[PDB]
Amino acid sequence: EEVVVVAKFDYVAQQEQELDIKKNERLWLLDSKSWWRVRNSMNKTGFVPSNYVER
Amino acid sequence: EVVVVAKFDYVAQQEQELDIKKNERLWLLDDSKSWWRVRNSMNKTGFVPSNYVER
């Protein structure tokens, strides 16, 4: 259920949940949800789709 | 770091995701930062900022 996308720039993972990629690398993306990293009041962080959440 | 409000429940599907409830207030870790979950050729998956990737 995927499409091959291409990295535009090197990205250096800042946290274990992130992915190191190099410029021009072929990657597989899903269906292509867009995610925000957030933290709740019990101080747990994680990703949620950004269309579930409002400023 | 700004406060955001959950518009709907979200049930985490992976350990990196976060369960939220409708109307829950959360802290958004970096505004102007949307993430895509991608997988590389060695089958490692992780989140990358979406503007580093070209579709």
Number of domains present in the structure of chain B: 1
Resolution for this PDB entry, in angstroms: 1.8
d(CA A48, CA A11): 21
Quick check: B22 contacting A, CB < 8 Å? Answer: no
**Nearest-CA distance from B1 to chain A in Å?**
10
Please name the residues in contact with B17: beta carbons below 8 A apart, sequence gap of 6 or more: A46, A47, A48, B10
Among B8, B18, B35, beta carbon nearest to A40: B18
Q: Can you give B1-55 as a three-state secondary structure string?
A: CEEEEECCCECCCCCCECCECCCCEEEECCCCCCEEEEECCCCCEEEEEHHHEEC
How was this structure determined? It was done by X-ray
A20's tokens: 């190191």
CA dihedral A46→A50→A55→B6, nearest 10 degrees, is -70
Does A30 reach chain B within 8 Å, measured CB to CB? yes
Give B-chain residues touching A22 at CB under 8 angstroms: none
Alpha carbon B10 to chain centroid, angstroms: 11
Q: Which domain covers residue A26, as residue numbers?
A: 1-55
